[PDB]
Structures are given as structure tokens and as C-alpha cells.
């Protein structure tokens, strides 16, 4: 399959930030502010199988994300925290595809 | 497995020039930035430089006024501490650190840098 | 730009609780991820916590990180301590600089 974004739960944490339905995601990486030097280390993963997503949310255990993705064809990179769930206690961002 | 073995340390007179290599293996060396950092009994571990990933941002701790440059060959998967001007108070056990964004993963076996006459 | 300062020692007891403490002298601990190294006699460190309270695989679980920001104070828990522990353990942060602070040497009598 292919990752595409389709719906946001408003209030969420992605649109809290800005994301907009109707993104191709192509990496999700580490987030927060890097030590001088390491700026450019790669430790994200660039992503295709939707299921891959979902994994780096659950690796992100709450922590901030930076995600790059495409803007009618235009690369642009958003960060944002996860938030821990009420209910069973699981990491989202609201990010209906 | 992830190997830094760290050589070209020795004794120094004050006043003249040492460089130092570190040389890597055991992971893709051009996705990682790489640092060099030292160590003494009395001063505990000091910051001393880092180099990125794609050899083209450097920086440098105020511990050294520019005197310290920092390269990497990535060819060699190696990077180098160029040390001019030293001083008596630069003797101390150099090591060089792998970065992963936020900390230092691994370590080398160290070398040691004395300056006497 | 900032200073972290840590005990010049602390003693504790074999398969005690034993909390270290990191105190960063200014700017907020939250603003930017703190570390844990472990340094035994004579040679170089090794990786117990990074990115505050992430636990490298081979590192035994009784070791544990957390951030408390009231005290703007970085704590490394050790559960059940063990005499293999004895060790130097440095804390470290970042920001426009490295800061590392001066050491904490861990003894554990009994």
C-alpha cells in the first residue's frame, strides 16, 4: 500500500501543529534539539509501509517527532510531541488516513 | 560490531603541534557526525570539538581559542584533531566519540597527549 | 553556557536504591536531553542512559533516568545495586555548547 493522509481529529496534536490532509509522508525522525555536530546524524526512517508510521509512533513513547513531507510536491518538515492517551495509554497524533 | 581505535598521541614540547586520528569502522562513517572530547583528573571531561556528518559544520569548545582544527576523511573513515599552540594545561587523555543526535554512543580506547619539555 | 554540577562521591550499599543527582546551574533541564555515562578505573565510558531515560540494549534494567524539572535536576536510579556498579558516573547536556559535569564516584560498601 501507500501512506497518504486523510483525516485530522481536530485538537489533536498534528493539528495543533498544522498538518492538513492529503500529505505524502516520506520520514519520521527524531525530534527536540540536537547537540552541536550531530545535527545531520540519521537515526529516523524513511517510511512507505503505513504500518512503518505507526511502529516509529510507538518507538517515539511520547517523545517529540519531526516528520517530512510533501506540500502539493513541496518538502516540509513538521515536529511535534505525541500525547499520551487517558484510556489505555498509547501515544497519538490524530492522523486519519 | 562498532570499532573507534584512536592513535598518533605521545609527548609534546609546549609551544608546538600534534595531530590525532581516530579511525572508525563498523558503521556507515558518513551518517555520523564524530567528536573529539578529554579528559584529566582535576578538570573532569572537557568538550573539546565536533565535526557533522557531512564534514561542512564544525564546532569548537572554549577551551581551545581557535587553536584546535577538526577534519574528517571520509574515505579513510577516519577524522583528525589538528592541535597547535599547546600548552602544559592541554596534557590530558583524548578520546574520540561517535554522536547519535543527542548523546555519545560509543568511545575509543583513548590516547594520551603529554605536554613537557 | 551552562554548568552541571554533581557530588564528588556518594556511598551507598550493596542492593540499596541509590539516586544520583545533576543540577544544571541555569536555563531550564528540560529545554535539552540529558545523559549518563559510566566510566570504570581506568577506562573509557560507556553509555548507561541517553536521551534522559532510554536504556541502551546490554544495559541492566535496574538502571533507570527521569527529569525533575522543580529541582531543574537530572536523576540516574539504580535499583538493587551491585558491586559491579562501582564506577565514575558523569552526567551530560548540550545546548550552543557540551557540558559535561564533574563526576560522581560511586562507592558501595558491604
Known amino acids: 500500500v501507500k501512506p497518504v493522509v486523510g483525516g485530522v481529529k481536530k485538537g489533536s496534536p498534528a493539528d495543533q501543529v498544522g498538518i492538513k490532509p492529503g500529505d505524502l509522508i516520506l520520514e519520521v525522525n527524531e525530534g527536540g534539539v540536537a547537540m552541536p555536530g550531530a545535527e545531520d546524524d540519521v537515526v529516523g526512517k524513511k517510511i512507505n509501509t503505513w504500518y512503518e508510521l505507526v511502529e516509529e509512533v510507538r518507538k517515539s513513547q511520547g517523545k517529540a517527532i519531526k516528520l517530512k513531507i510533501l506540500r502539493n510536491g513541496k518538502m516540509i518538515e513538521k515536529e511535534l510531541i505525541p500525547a499520551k492517551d487517558p484510556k489505555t495509554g498509547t501515544y497519538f497524533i490524530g492522523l486519519f488516513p | 560490531e562498532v570499532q573507534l581505535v584512536e592513535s598518533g598521541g605521545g609527548l609534546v614540547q609546549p609551544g608546538r603541534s600534534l595531530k590525532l586520528s581516530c579511525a572508525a569502522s563498523?558503521?556507515?562513517?558518513?551518517?555520523?557526525?564524530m567528536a573529539w572530547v578529554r579528559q584529566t583528573p582535576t578538570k573532569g571531561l572537557e568538550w573539546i570539538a565536533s565535526?557533522?556528518?557531512?564534514?561542512?559544520?564544525?564546532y569548537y569548545g572554549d577551551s581551545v581559542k581557535g587553536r584546535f582544527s577538526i577534519s574528517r576523511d571520509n574515505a579513510k573513515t577516519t577524522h583528525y584533531l589538528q592541535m597547535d599552540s599547546l600548552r602544559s594545561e592541554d596534557t590530558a587523555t583524548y578520546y574520540c566519540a561517535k554522536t547519535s543526535r543527542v548523546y555519545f554512543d560509543y568511545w575509543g580506547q583513548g590516547v594520551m597527549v603529554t605536554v613537557s619539555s | 553556557q551552562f554548568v552541571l554540577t554533581q557530588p564528588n562521591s556518594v556511598s551507598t550499599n550493596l542492593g540499596s536504591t541509590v539516586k544520583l543527582s545533576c543540577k544544571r546551574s541555569?536555563?531550564?533541564?528540560?529545554?535539552?536531553?540529558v545523559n549518563w555515562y559510566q566510566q570504570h578505573e581506568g577506562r573509557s565510558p560507556t553509555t548507561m542512559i541517553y536521551?534522559?531515560?532510554?536504556?541502551p540494549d546490554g544495559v541492566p534494567d535496574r538502571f533507570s533516568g527521569s527529569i525533575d524539572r522543580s529541582s531543574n535536576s537530572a536523576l540516574l536510579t539504580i535499583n538493587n545495586v551491585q558491586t559491579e556498579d562501582e564506577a565514575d558516573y558523569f552526567c551530560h547536556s548540550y545546548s550552543s555548547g557540551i557540558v559535561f559535569g564533574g563526576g560522581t564516584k560511586l562507592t558501595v560498601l558491604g
Open positions: 563498523g558503521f556507515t562513517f558518513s551518517n555520523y557526525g
Open positions: 565535526i557533522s556528518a557531512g564534514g561542512d559544520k564544525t
Open positions: 541555569t536555563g531550564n533541564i528540560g529545554s535539552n536531553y
Open positions: 536521551r534522559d531515560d532510554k536504556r
